[model samples]
Target chain A: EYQSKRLESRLLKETREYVIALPEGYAQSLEAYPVVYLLDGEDQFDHMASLLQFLSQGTMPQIPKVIIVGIHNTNRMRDYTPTHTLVLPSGNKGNPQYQHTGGAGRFLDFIEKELAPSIESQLRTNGINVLVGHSFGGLVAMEALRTDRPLFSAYLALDTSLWFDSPHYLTLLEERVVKGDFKQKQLFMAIANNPLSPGFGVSSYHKDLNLAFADKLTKLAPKGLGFMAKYYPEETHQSVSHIGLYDGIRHLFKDFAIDIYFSKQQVIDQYGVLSERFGHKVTPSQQYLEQLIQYSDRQQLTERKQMLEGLRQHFA
Target chain B: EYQSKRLESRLLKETREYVIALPEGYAQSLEAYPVVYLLDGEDQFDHMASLLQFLSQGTMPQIPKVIIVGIHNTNRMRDYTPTHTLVLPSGNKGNPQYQHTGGAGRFLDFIEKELAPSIESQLRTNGINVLVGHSFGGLVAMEALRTDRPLFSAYLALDTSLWFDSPHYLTLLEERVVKGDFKQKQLFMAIANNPLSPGFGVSSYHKDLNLAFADKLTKLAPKGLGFMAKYYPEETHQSVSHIGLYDGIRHLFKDFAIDIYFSKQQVIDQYGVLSERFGHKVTPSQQYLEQLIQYSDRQQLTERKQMLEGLRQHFA
Candidate 1:
């Protein structure tokens, strides 16, 4: 179900550790699946893997089957922050070794050139990639998403540290939108209600900053970009990741649920819509077609059975 | 974080399997934790364990840190059903081995006497125990909750198969209610909108039955029992458990969020209310007090620090 893996990263010059969890029947089936690259692997991998499995169950799947690759942190602050300047707030600059900041570009390079290629070469990936990050990691996710040649097709950021360098990150995103760099991209941003969040001060304006970020992004609505932002008033900064992950994944795969009882024509139509949204030719996997064919036979829908059989053969 | 355990259940006459997950610092701390006993261990254990940990984390914790015990099933249908008769509409009566219809009583006995004693003897546990079950397993949970001498103080039932015996099970609950069997008990029931659920004919009235059940239970409002029910229109029967578990746990521990910044008097008063609601005297663990004292020192709230120091000494 899980494999603790290590990679000799020439870029990072360290033996980077990760855990990969494959979907059910992954070994037996020839089907390729989408991959989710998660930050803070040691803390979140087990839960994320189980959550994906629950959502993509055969009985009633909400999302596509996916491989979860959780990257364990070696130097979280170094790899996650985009800037070396810590002059704004949170007062981490007062501590020693603030020099280790601003390594996000190098980390993203490692992922795109080294880590992702390694994973794609070793595993069966369907070419659709997702990057998930939280807090400082969320900063990395936003940076990755803003790039024109992004490593991932989707970016899910939870309770991101937008207060880092404050309006700089926001301006970066705005510049990207203006330049049409966000076209055909997908991003989900989630903010937690942490008005009285510990540290930063007795009362943090962190929530206000994130709310402003959400409002600006929503107003922009760059063409051809699928964007979403959600506010969780009931959850805190530390706890927002759990619910945010679920909502983010659900948002990325919006309109992807095809019921087992869907007619053959309905299935095709749904996939057609998915293809358009994904900017790729999307089709049900052969395994899914086989299941549909069997279900059709059970229901004694001879026409549907024939159609599904043809669909299976076409994919085959 | 997780242990795969086996118990020689004398009542079941077989070695029952389970998984136990401990909270952070459990090995180092002397605090006793509440336990959640979950059914369908093989499928749901990893997620439930992680979910509990996420909810009970030290930073902005919503609930107390707790242990998670997942009981793997040997014979799900056999152990989950309360009645031998299979005259219901699901039409499983035609199946070859309908003889093993009911073993719920024996299963409850095994859990209450053998498994619980084994767990209690092996680990540090608070007096509070919660039972969580889904589908057929939820039937077992309801059966357990109905008893005058139940094994767990709280029951969380998700997408329960109440149509197993339909009105018979309803009547049984009514009888128990009349006998005042629910005093000092807590139960949560959740139902999914699976109107076109597979099997049980093209249109399943399963949602109706659960809705009626919810209505009756709410109307009855048995004194001295805390009860809640939720309906998920967006989720299918197979997918209800994930969200239901979160909501059910939240409901059981409603009004349990104690802010780390709470004044000393506030902490004591909150615990006092909790003790009354839980039907037992409850106090913040020494570990929690230590965290609060440290936080108080950081905030330089001298009066709060003094109060917290005294409280810690009293608990010690």
Candidate 2:
């Protein structure tokens, strides 16, 4: 279910680590799945992969089975930063480390033009993509949507640096999805109550900027886009990503769970919703669904017969 | 940091594979950490390991660093079941699987006398222990508290079959914890809204039993023992553990988040509360604290300085 390696990136011309995980029974089923790119794989892959594995399980699982590509980092600051701002905030003299930093576009190219094709060639993918990142890596994931056409079907940015070094970069996003330009793409932004910044103190600075951006999105586009943002005041900048990832993914897959009293059509509709979002005809696994039916027949209330009758009536 | 292998156990008289995960920098600090016993590691090791790693990060972490021992199962039904109930429920002819299934006590003995001592002898441990399991494995975890004096510091049971076999075993728990027998130990039970048992349909069977147990714990003892239970209405019995683990860990470490607005005394108080619950004095990591100080010096309004000044004032 898990394998990792240091691969030579022709695009970056450097060696980088890539970790991978496929769902249980993936080999036996002979199925392709939507893939996720975990940007900070060296740092973020373990937990993200683990969470993904669980969310994508059972008869009525939270999400469809997925192929996860954990892409590691070499020089985080150089590759992840849209434009470096730490030195300016520190009020320091020009340093070589800070000079050649904004290479996120190249990294995006490495993912889309190079990494995605190479990965698609090797693994089974259903032409669906998701990019997830935290902190600086989150900044890059959001930046992907801002400048480039989003290559993935979904974007999950956990505590994305919406307030990255300068405020100007945010309004720049007004050019894209601020008004429904991203009809086909989905974005979920998880913002932490970051009270302190490198250049600011006890500020709602990040939230303020994030809100303005969200306001623009609401103002410009009414619908036809999938966008959700949640603010966790009790969560610190670092802690937010852990819980945010959980809730964010939960929100992303909210349609998968069926109500116990649901009509047969409800289950079918739930599957359709999941399919539409994940770019596949998602449905319950046969093995687990059978298990559920057998279980219902054994329990009290004996509603299994009626429950199945409601749904089975369609074929009958 | 993961290395896993099978080891011989004298009590179980068999070899069992166990997965191990140390904090990112276990060797550098030469410190002891709370050790966790993850039952059902055979099925859940990777995700549990990954999730624990993120929850125990050095900066803005959820909980203190700890060692995780994912103990894989050899004979699940025989070892995990406290008793057999399926036969009585369905009026089935008595079967062998139902006859010899109640072997949980011996398994508990194996963990306490054989596995725990062996692990502690080799790994640095802070004497706080947590046992986590799901379904039948979860049944055994909660069974440990209902019968024997607790061997670990905390027990987390995800979707525990509290209504397993029959509902008789639940009242047996009130004989102890409802009257404060588990005063020094902590127990967290996560219940999924299982509407039916394997034999019947549309029954709130699991919830009814689970609630009775919680109701007893709440009514009989107010504050002597640390007890928590969460109900996931959207999650099915089979799918509860995925989101349950994510949420259960967050609740287990709810007091660990160090707030930015807190004064010096508040930080110490926060540590004291964590220490009191976990049976150890938890302190901030040097790397993160120093990073915080450096950040304070560089940021506006000297907020970090002012923040730390408030905390340090108590010592001054």
Candidate 3:
């Protein structure tokens, strides 16, 4: 039973679209996996979906397959950033050009109240939800982290345009830091090496923003709040998210290791015996078995006997 | 005087269609950097752009600033894949059903003969070029690496659909591996665990295809073909591409030790100095510099001092 469904819900009487990807055997097995909810569904869904697949494989983390919900945006500007701006720093009418802003609160309300329930009703999974966003979407992610810290277990923000409206977000963060009492959360933000455009140069703007944000977040020091910020100098604003997402996944799951109880030679010998007994070409390479070992490690298996027994049972 | 612009002339025919990102003070500096060309420009431009920005900050690798050429695809299927199928084995029509196929050969020709020349004409840099592709574009990248081996120095294929047309590509790859020679080339293919669908089970088929292909490739006596295959078990087909792209880029530029040189502290220190010296508030942080170092390491660098000194000269 695969988890594949599309749902449309109304937030504040406006239509919001979302897509979800479930774990393997999720429908058939009574097992739960972590959930990662991403903004900009249309742009990031497939990419995130693919990443989950690779990371959950036997060779990698085998961190129980996850369910991904991609929230598609109709009015990104309206729903992403916290503060509204009439014009971009470039003096262009950012709102008039795109025609939407200041609806982030409403949009977020929909996510917290409406979308969350829809997900609960449709997909059966464990707790621990993740929120991912890029650029303006990242602003929303940060907003959610700040206001609704309990809603998501993790946050992955890529190339966040923190410089929105002359670093309005930074200013707010500074104030928050000074006031203190902020809760901690798992936060990972990746910024692309954005060059100096017509107005901003590559100086300390990015550094200052990160430091200020991190310092304040550290002060809150809530339970399970892990923050990591990375810079991809070779990547552009667009490419930064791609790298950030990958690094975040790896970082989150880095602790999971694979365990292989059988030695390469033993597995090879067993495969040879099994192949001969079953009358098939049984040449399981050492690497393949190693991958299985790694998988077992991530899955917390003490021995490979079960896996071997299952394999034998399947072909015996 | 940039080597990249000089090489561009040899690879591109219509130079105007391509826009290159030059390094800071490139017009005045006597430095060179590596270059990467990304397909599906409009979609991936910002992503790659951000990565380059973070990697080139002298915190990662002291490698030359990168020159990025975002190649927008007008007709993706036509320009990305190697072969055309009349009917997809899963009962999907490859023809008008999707509205495009079979232009990859021409696109490759453009890169090798025309685009390369254009780049060379505009800059003076080494002939180190990387090709990155996603989805069908990734298929093109694989084809180029396998059939047109000499075209690119490295390849980053993110979530490539190897099962297109019933694993036809895999079969071709098998045949090619036995007959052709791919030496001194770097290739990274990322596969996300895609759920099985009734129509084709694209994810499963691609996973199997990748496994088969990787198994064969790895067995081939190591003729200078450095290969890495990553699977994102939890990521969907779409989202997988982003993470894969990042991992592939890092793998392709693995020799460049960009990360160590640009520690976050160094970046923060540099920004602090810059802010204090320039009487402007510099916002760069130690973390930003640290991440930059990671990307730079992926691009290859041994000494952070050299990188710092070079940047100092440029900023001065």
Candidate 4:
């Protein structure tokens, strides 16, 4: 059960890999827990997993014992971008030579028709589903909001390539939002100061374009569309994603606050059991517990009462 | 002249392009200011330039009217590492095929002996010199400290690949410190949790090695080594350098503070000017002044009357 698995269906195919962290008492209890699906598995799995494990215990109970599904990339360019164009940075045309240009349509199809069903079959609870991506991955997340809003309750796009294939991609997005209704979806986009060539005009053009897109979305998005965009001018293209990812997760799940006062064993009992049940191996260490406390504090659930009664109950 | 310049010398030979930001009232006032050399010039020139411009003015001041030299990388791998090794991640043997692995020694020599002298001659200032780098550039910075301690007054190594090549790099570094004498040096190294295969067993090993190295260095160098390390456990290999760079610069020069009560234009006028006598077409901006102010405030010099008076007179 702990081994990696790939799921395929008639509509869409996905490689679904998960890391399940159990409560320390899972060996004796028959309790169920929440689950988190982390998009961009190739990049963010280990760090986020470690973070979640540490944050779900003790006095700081901002999170819960759960399973993390990291969705790895196959044809990222095609699946992430909403539309296809020839103007890549390498100057490669979006032709047959670049066979992997416009796969987002199919990718979203798979996530909704195949991946979601498969995950529901495996996990015990209908926990939070998060889609995360950097650059192109971010673009896909935006598309997900526009096309497959119900597939994921939350979307985190970090420094997404909003300027990809020219401004046409986002313009099309604006057109779609104007015509349709947006479901109750959580969307967060992080933009960094990506300096463009002077030959390409002002360096702030990309930032300005992103702002325009955000402004339009804010004005035109359906009443229930939970959307926010943060601009990190000090961070560059490569570094902003990191800060964005952390902030994205926290902001998306702002409501789930847990306790951190539990003893070490208590934390393990509550948060470390899933791993044991699933035959996953992880050492219970002081550093791990400290991280849990930090996460709970961040989520503003530092009280012990909040952990057992509020957080555990919410997830249980 | 604001034109680019390239020089090839025995120690270091490459393009040494610069953008000088002169202080205000320069036609009437004669003053020298500090200098900051940003590594990865080809990549970070515009970003650093804009940041410095913004920091020079406004409420806070971290740096005075300064000169920024952006050193473009020609052969990063050769010029950044401390020692040459034969083994790479792909099990490739090191030889002529890996010539770039050991050029850092020469690169430092170029910066300390040749580049520093040339910059001083060109800029006509004996103010403080700061060296900055990201990734392999950061590796060069660390190596520079070991070999050319007096080349720059401060060193900023952002998200450095301290774990690069092998765990042996840190071990070798430890052995050198234990065996040699290190002079006064100001250093900042930032680490981001980049993905390392558990099977490869390098990440944790490097963490342990860094702790040991820092412990040994602290015990041995008591005088002028202002050393600090920050860990962004959520950042990836590609995204950590930007934050690391900004934070490194801010932390290294955090001695100056900004006075928010000052008028924005007044701050800019005081810090932005280039005189005809200097034969350079450049002037610092409000941004640079702001950074200096922040740095001063962080260093608890906000209320330092004497220093403030000196700054006012120096710029005037």
Candidate 5:
């Protein structure tokens, strides 16, 4: 279950609605968690919320318990696209289909200056943030990643519409990849199968643009920029986001997994390793340590139980 | 999101509890859909329910809108394990950890005779059932598959504990695979990374048994038994189920994906293909068709809209 919050955005000239899914023990614990800002909330919030909960549970959790903020989109074309051009990289020209395009800057400003600040002030956050988006929203995610003042630490872009605005957006992306200082920034981009008609003379514009962008970014990636690009030949554009988000989270937190069967010393050392890998002082979550303490009691491991009990004092 | 149901089972001699997640718009539409019965519901229900909803929505759905029945367990070892044995394939014996094992037969009997019948009587169903489980629960799922009168049409086993009771279970499974009447039945098995310590001088019993079972089944499978086995070296035993279930669903319904951009005739033909592939008459869901009709109207494709409108009557 999530709580809905309304924000009146002066920049976007609308009252924006967003939902926040706090971690399970939010009320009982005073811990600050990382947050993931998800675009296309109407489509993705429920699934992403469920996925985060699942990944962050069990004895060997793959990720941390984090906050989920789903931004309900008003006009995807206007909010997600970076330009208002009628012509696209697919050779589609002179279409009146995108009259309200190219409002990403204003929308992002609304998020950064208003939405994020409002949430951080109201809730406990560890200052780490991730942005997740698909299709046009994904293009905006990459755009957010390339900003001079990066708003998020990690970006998950699933089957993004890189062909939008043609080479203009791609060139800007390339410039950011080559020249921008992206210290501690990470991007996980997923490309779905080409959607063009079989044997058509026209080449696959979206798929080609995504591949080119991935290749260029890899080659020109700045230091401290973690980049991963995955190609799902079997998945269509609509079907890749679910799998993409799952993989993206795993990749972003590749060092977060700790085997529950590890000895007490090993568990302690693994947390240290995780802390260094994530550029933060990470420790076992209070709930996680409590669960382990109970497990140790059941297994009659008094030494491990005492060790976990001592560690619980940190949260206490 | 789901309704909690309780049944005092005569077979199990306990008050069994389960949760049912009906698809969106279930009451408005008198549609009978397939059902997925999940084991270890306490651990998996929320996530699986969300995953099903996500995959079954949007313009192009990868799977059908199915009912989710998550079976909550009171005693996992008593219900999931097939045999009560102190000896296992891992060279450990005379342990008192399995006193309550070997109740899978009783548990399955309860499902087949009581649980499923009660559910079917209370709800609309197309009579197709899928069984999903992991670890010990997965072992029981496979056992259910090999039954002379199979209870479920499809089985998804993630990181199954195949080494339990060792050669006895394997022999029975091999006999069923080679000679059993598994027409119109399928199984998707997933194997996680080997958990045995390196250079421990002991082979990986669980991983090895799973691989051996997959190899033997491939060579000995009956004519109509659809079978697939995937090995995930990247996922641990505890972490494989989420990915395994995702992949298993895709594998079982590999022909379910339909492109929304396909023409009216193309969409019709694709449904025909899906029907034949699944051995059942399959058509676009009411929601899917309705969404497509709206899309066609927006795009001013009158013919496609008319076609979609006509098809909606089949569900209506």
Candidate 6:
């Protein structure tokens, strides 16, 4: 499903493996793609492509063709966390035997300066990028969003662990994002159910932090920031992340499809918005409308036929 | 998402591209795999490859290793349909010169005689095969099941089209299958809500025939035909196939996983069922039970410990 590459990062002074899943017809789509940058790349790369696979197919392509670049990890705790004041739920609080924590800034620099250039050199790009991070990786994405404005067009933080550093990073993110100029920015959050316990129950604590962030974003509702929150109460943390990632991408492109139940006029009504969103000309294909006409005859759909006919007349 | 290879089909008298997707670590896994063959390879290959990537990831592996072989099409209309003896409502019982249909038999010959051998030479196989077909391909899959028994272990027919040749082929297949010995076979059918009108509306007509076949299998209770039917009213013909393919695999492997909600004893309860299913030893991993103990009291998980201990004692 993907090819692997290793790159030397001067910022981190280390070599990291990058897994890239190129879309079908990548060699000749005659179009540059919006890249999907995934954190914990080694772990999440293949699944992300798989999820994208389902989201992209159908009567109409639900999502555009895009490249997936997974950043292979090196010292996740150090690079993913924003602060060193982390306490493990296993009752180990900063024992310091393992690698030291809090090196996201340097890691991101390697991405923006080194890796981004490396990708751009070999591939054609549209400059629209998405950052998807889960847990500590999610925290790292938040750090990137706050520090570097508009580097990514969309941010998908699935179950971003808020319990890390006890919101020392989260607070900064909330405050800045609420008031920031966020036109054309999209963000989606997925929360999995984790019940609380009396003790330091960090799993439960993380869930609360997750909810609080969701609450903060909802209450704020910053202008021009396209946001969606999905609470998967029925699934486990791992299971939800598996399913939620697809839900996240689908929500990002939810408005693109002409709903089956929609009248012909509805297709005409939403055509302009979808066209603007895609940044390309999009009119309902004659084949699509003809196929729909066979299965339907609602009074409202007559308007759709009229529109389709008008286009035909203009062409003739 | 996949690589394309060209192969010469003796029966079809042409060289066609095969869209092949190999499982991760195919060379190192040192294990044989079942193959899932798909029709309309160019259109469907990437989605199948993507879905398999998601379903087949993890420690225990959600799906056993599988090689995806998508038969790319040259003449879909000719090969995918069985007979053109379709009766039209207005006029014309059967229209000729529609590219002279009914080449499924020759295509199946090329697959069984040529394609299977080609795949076998390159990869290790477990001899279990799954055939996935949508629309006309679905009709072809039914033809294989009827004409060639036990060629595939399971049949996944998504919205198997009934419009072409109407119920001519479906009626013939049903008459033979009820009296046939179908031990150790599986089939899953998905019916899309086809709401179209004008001259029998063909779309809605297929759903009835689709359900009729499913009902026939259920009542006949063939010795080993594990049959399932999913009705997706909200999804269109194109969309249901993508979703239904996963449901087909999960349904095929439903009894394999230990349920998360299971207490210590239930693992033992399910061990034998799972053991017989995979023809391998099935027990809860030591690490899994150890992790479960944290959210619960030691006493609460005492049965869990006992089960592990009992498994060890039995092994020793």
| The 10-residue segment with the lowest total lDDT in model 3 chain A | A277-286
On residues B1-316, what C-alpha lDDT tens digit does candidate 3 reach at each position? 1122222333334333555776655666554445688887766665455555444454333233567777765566667767777666577666563555655777888887777766776676555677888877888787787675465767888877776665666677667667755655677878776554324532376566666676677787345566788877766565665557656766544433323315535655655653443233433322333355454555465556456444444433
lDDT of each: 0.79, 0.71, 0.62, 0.59, 0.80, 0.69
Off by over 4 Å in 3: A1-10, A89-92, A95-99, A177-184, A197-208, A215-224, A256-316, B1-316
Candidate 1 off by > 4 Å: A88-94, A195-199, A260-265, B90-94, B178-181, B195-199
The alpha-carbon root-mean-square deviation between model 2 and the true structure, to one decimal in Å, is 4.9
Q: Model 5, range A215-308, lDDT digits (tens) per residue?
A: 8877877776778999999877888988899989988877655444456567677778656544566676777677778867876875778777
- Among incorrect, acceptable, medium and high, the docking class of model 1 is medium
lDDT accuracy of residue B144 in candidate 2: 84
Per residue, candidate 2 scores C-alpha lDDT tens digits across B175-275 of 66645645466778787877665544457876777777777776776454788888788677877776677677778777766555556667887878777
Over the stretch A1-316, how does candidate 2's per-residue lDDT look in tens digits? 5687666778788987788887676677546677888887876777777778787775556766778999988887778877755454335533565565788888888887777887888887767788888877787877787764456777888876666555555656665564444545678878777775544556777667666766666566635467888878766677676667777778876765544646677787777776776544555544334445655565442565566545544433
- lDDT score, residue B131, model 3? 85
Ten contiguous residues with the weakest lDDT in model 1 chain A = A90-99
Residue lDDT tens for model 6, A249-279: 7677666455454444565567677555433
Docking class of 3: incorrect
Candidate 1 residue-wise lDDT, A1-316, digit = tens: 7898999999999999998988877888889988999998978777777887788886556677888999999988789988786555655453444467789888999999899999999999887888999888998988887765455778889998877766676688668776653546787888898746324654657777778877877787777678889999888887888889988998787576655545656777888877776666677865656666787787787587888886676656
Cα displacement (angstroms), candidate 2, residue A220, comes to 4.5
> How would you order the candidates by lDDT, starting with the best?
5, 1, 2, 6, 3, 4
Model 4 CA lDDT for position B143: 75
The better candidate by lDDT, 2 or 6, is 2
Candidate 1 fraction of reference contacts recovered: 0.62
TM-score of chain B of each: 0.92, 0.85, 0.71, 0.70, 0.89, 0.79
TM-score of each: 0.94, 0.83, 0.48, 0.44, 0.82, 0.70
Badly placed stretches (over 4 Å) of model 5 are A8-14, A24-30, A85-99, A194-203, A258-316, B25-31, B85-99, B194-203, B258-316
Question: Lowest-lDDT window of 10 residues in candidate 5 chain A?
Answer: A194-203
